[PDB]
Design a binder for this molecule. Sequence first.
Ligand SMILES: Cc1cccc(N(CC(=O)N2CCCCC2)C(=O)N2CCC[C@H](C(N)=O)C2)c1
Ligand SMILES: [Zn+2]
Length: 140
Amino acid sequence: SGAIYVGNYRVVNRHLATHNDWANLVWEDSSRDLLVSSTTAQGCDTIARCDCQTGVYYCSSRRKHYPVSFSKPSLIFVEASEYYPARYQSHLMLAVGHSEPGDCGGILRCQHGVVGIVSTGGNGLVGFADVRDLLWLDEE
Ligand SMILES: Cc1cccc(N(CC(=O)N2CCCCC2)C(=O)N2CCC[C@H](C(N)=O)C2)c1
Ligand SMILES: [Zn+2]
């Protein structure tokens, strides 16, 4: 679990969204595994606006933050799951790292701010849903 809190927005994995998230929906995209809802309080996270390919992510199954090198956002095949059918998940970045299906939501960050959140994993890989192209998170 985990979310990004920027301005009056809460960014979570679409497959982990609550009823309150759906009742206060701003935007969602199943192909990216992202959902954004509105908040009453203002958040403290800042979004990175860069093309960094190195950063650090939080892994809840180890209570640790790990430095990683990660690929550029791409269309990668995600196996059928209990959340989605076999499909191409878009805007996904891969790295070598530990992940379990409770690690989703952990933040990946660089020197510029938040880059994305854990969305996929297994066999010593971890995938992150990028948010750096969602310029609207910085306003309104
Ligand atoms: C973070 C992480 C670590 C390990 C595994 C996963 N799994 C696979 C998985 O949940 N399982 C159950 C256990 C072993 C078999 C497959 C994923 O990549 N998922 C699940 C959640 C939705 C993801 C998506 N964004 O499409 C795909 C995730
Ligand atoms: Zn950066």
